[PDB]
Ligand binder design. Structure first.
Ligand SMILES: *[C@@H](CO)COc1ccc([N+](=O)[O-])cc1
Ligand SMILES: *[C@@H](CO)COc1ccc([N+](=O)[O-])cc1
Lengths: 99, 99
């Protein structure tokens, strides 16, 4: 199945049972979500994007249900204006960019 | 043909004959390049990303050669740390996200 990119490619994902609307982004190496609570077992990171960088909390082996599959992967939480699933997860889901 | 996302999906594009290395990004609505010179016929814009927003120069109907096709589309130039082709162009190229 595939997303045609006329509209933003957005899905609903369950991260540790919490539902979140995420943008699937081939231009992110990482995934970063906000408004989810995931533990005190994190390592601090800073990731950069267009306007500069942000502080994040890297959480490993989180549980994620999306597109009828349950995968485990690294998620960061931080003050992103949009939740994205980077390439770290898109590869876990077998996604390719096709033309 | 398709990109498998184990590596960043990067191509070389010719924009008004200038070669530029670009990241194909399904999470960008817009394309923004730096280090290219494109005219004084632009409209000012500001686009936001992760660390905040940036000032851009929107140029319309620019000439772009990429993946064996010559398309025309809107390109912005501004101080991006990475050059990306947003969804405005990926649709011009018939790209879908497949799984
Ligand atoms: C597309 C979605 O906004 C942009 O992706 C990136 C911007 C900046 C960087 N970086 O500075 O490393 C990577 C990806
Ligand atoms: C993925 C590549 O870095 C991120 O894409 C976006 C970040 C932020 C926004 N926004 O604030 O509208 C859009 C896309």
């Amino acid at each position: 199945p595939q997303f045609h990119l006329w509209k933003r490619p957005v899905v609903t994902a369950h991260i540790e049972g919490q539902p979140v609307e995420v943008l699937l982004d081939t231009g992110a190496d990482d995934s970063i979500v906000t408004g989810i609570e995931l533990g005190p077992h994190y390592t601090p990171k800073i990731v950069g994007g267009i306007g500069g960088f942000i502080n994040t909390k890297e959480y490993k082996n989180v549980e994620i249900e999306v597109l009828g599959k349950r995968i485990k992967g690294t998620i960061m939480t931080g003050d992103t204006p949009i939740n994205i699933f980077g390439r770290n997860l898109l590869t876990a889901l077998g996604m390719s960019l096709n033309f």
